[PDB]
Design a protein around this ligand. Sequence first.
Ligand SMILES: NC(=O)C1=CN([C@@H]2O[C@H](COP(=O)(O)OP(=O)(O)OC[C@H]3O[C@@H](n4cnc5c(N)ncnc54)[C@H](OP(=O)(O)O)[C@@H]3O)[C@@H](O)[C@H]2O)C=CC1
Ligand SMILES: CC1(C)N=C(N)N=C(N)N1OCCCOc1ccc(Br)cc1
Length: 159
Amino acid sequence: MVGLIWAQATSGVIGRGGDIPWRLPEDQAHFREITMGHTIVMGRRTWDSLPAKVRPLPGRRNVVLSRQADFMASGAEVVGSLEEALTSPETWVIGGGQVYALALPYATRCEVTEVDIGLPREAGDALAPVLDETWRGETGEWRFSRSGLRYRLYSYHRS
Ligand SMILES: NC(=O)C1=CN([C@@H]2O[C@H](COP(=O)(O)OP(=O)(O)OC[C@H]3O[C@@H](n4cnc5c(N)ncnc54)[C@H](OP(=O)(O)O)[C@@H]3O)[C@@H](O)[C@H]2O)C=CC1
Ligand SMILES: CC1(C)N=C(N)N=C(N)N1OCCCOc1ccc(Br)cc1
């Protein structure tokens, strides 16, 4: 089982300037709850973007994809190919744009957080993968974050 988990603006934007262009602490808790105790896979850029206090993310086996054979990621398993990364039975791909696109075909689940923020795509942005008709989904109720932004959760699947 390979799953993808991400938070996106309605526009599809998930990253800009090496960051996540919004604040939504409630999403942090959701991400943690889904991924806790499992293997997580991320691209090297996503690894770099992790705040040092949570690098590596606790209680999870951190796997980092990089083309540099000798890249140093303390507390994480550096692998050079997708096949080396997706070996665990329950793997959660946690970003970024390049890795989501790379792992989507191996995925049978997507846990998505839509953030109701006006944020038109700009060149160079990290973007969420687009889910086609092979996916069946359930949409949750809109909720207000203490940061003022509305957000809702989607759970997609395919067999
Ligand atoms: N909103 C959300 O849910 C999330 C948003 N983000 C945001 O996404 C952005 C980062 O995304 P993005 O730039 O797309 O980067 P990625 O996180 O997807 O990392 C890309 C890197 O992964 C490695 N890589 C990619 N393909 C391969 C391959 N086929 N084999 C080996 N290594 C490979 C490379 O490492 P190298 O260059 O070392 O070879 C590459 O530079 C940031 O802005 C971040 O904040 C990240 C996660 C979640
Ligand atoms: C966007 C986020 C978090 N939430 C969803 N639903 N899915 C993601 N893949 N997540 O990104 C994971 C990589 C960055 O996560 C962290 C974790 C803790 C801190 Br502190 C800062 C960043």
